[PDB]
Amino acid sequence: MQVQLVESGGGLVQAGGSLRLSCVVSGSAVSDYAMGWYRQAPGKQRELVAAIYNSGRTNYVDSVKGRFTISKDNAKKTVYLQMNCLKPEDTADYFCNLLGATTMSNAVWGQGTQVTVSSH
Ligand SMILES: [Hg+2]
């Protein structure tokens, strides 16, 4: 199967501010697979920060608990990432994808959405 991903919602934001990223997915991937938001800081590799499962349950990395919130809408085929209490460590390109896309030979990452956090 082929999936297509389009992230949006990023931009320049002051420290402590907030942003909401959106992730529109093709086919039936949001409802069928577990979805996750990834970020790739300058120099680093993509890391999973938030994951949402078929039950609607969520799991986060320690650094983002209380600041990030992930949610999805199956009808809209969209995965959301509410980002609060932003820090310079949150400056990165943010991507969404299937929680298991390593199995798929079509390594399809999206263009992502850039997030930049300034200093008041
Ligand atoms: Hg916070």
Numbering used by the authors: 1 to 120
Question: What are the paper's exact sentences on this?
Answer:
Nbs are derived from natural llama heavy-chain antibodies that are devoid of a light chain and in which the heavy-chain variable domain (VHH) exclusively mediates the interaction with the antigen. The VHH domain is structurally similar to the IgG VH domain, with three complementary-determining regions (CDRs) that are responsible for antigen binding. We describe the introduction of cysteine residues at conserved framework serine positions in a Nb specific for human complement component C5 and subsequent site-specific labelling with Hg derivatives and structure determination by SAD and SIRAS. Hg incorporation did not perturb the structure of the Nb or its antigen-binding capacity.
For the derivatized protein we obtained crystals at two very different pH values of 3.5 (Nb36-C85-1) and 7.5 (Nb36-C85-2). To investigate the potential of the Hg-derivatized Nbs for rapid and automated structure determination without prior phase information, we analysed two SAD data sets exhibiting space groups P212121 (Nb36-C85-1) and P21 (Nb36-C85-2). Owing to the low symmetry, 180° of spindle rotation was required to obtain a complete set of anomalous differences. Since only a minor difference between the anomalous signal in the two segments 1–180° and 180–360° was observed we did not pursue SIRAS phasing in this case, but instead performed SAD phasing based on all 360° of data. This resulted in a set of phases with an overall FOM of 0.34 based on 19 sites in eight groups. The Nb molecule that was placed manually appears to have a slight rotational freedom within the crystal packing, since the CDR pole of the Nb has very poor electron density, whereas the opposite end containing Cys85 has much better defined density. Two of the Hg atoms are each inserted between two side chains, as also observed in the P212121 crystal form. As for the P212121 Hg sites there is little or no density that may be readily attributed to a benzoic acid moiety of PCMB.
